[PDB]
Amino acid sequence: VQIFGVHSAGKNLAEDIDFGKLVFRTVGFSGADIRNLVNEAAIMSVRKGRSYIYQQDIVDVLDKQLLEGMGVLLTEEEQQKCEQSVSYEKKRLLAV
């Protein structure tokens, strides 16, 4: 938390920013990892045109970093079309 505060001082964090609720997502991180997380949060906040960094910005940055791990690099349209490709009977089994 202190490293995140040090490396995210000179950026316009919004009122919903709190790193105390995202500590468990950064277990094993070093200072460079948290700095890269802050930088990617700034990039993604710029990406949607958002002026500040939201908590959803950091959440989506961590989620993108996690989804990139297993070899899934898909945009929103491809993901939605692929979700619509499967049927409904074989989706309720996964849901259950």
Partner: protein
């Protein structure tokens, strides 16, 4: 005296397709490098090496 300091190759982004996520991610880095002042105002720094 062999390295080509080529300014134009004739191959654009429209020629390479199918990996639009990687294309957009490289577009972000290229735009950051070209527009370093505007994005550096908010503290964004580009990576030195992309592999």
């Amino acid at each position: 005296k062999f390295i080509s300091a080529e300014e134009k190759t004739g191959v654009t982004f429209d020629d390479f397709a199918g990996q639009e996520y990687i294309k957009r991610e490289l577009q972000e880095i290229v735009r950051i490098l070209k527009n370093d002042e505007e994005f550096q105002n908010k503290g964004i720094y580009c990576p030195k090496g992309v592999l």
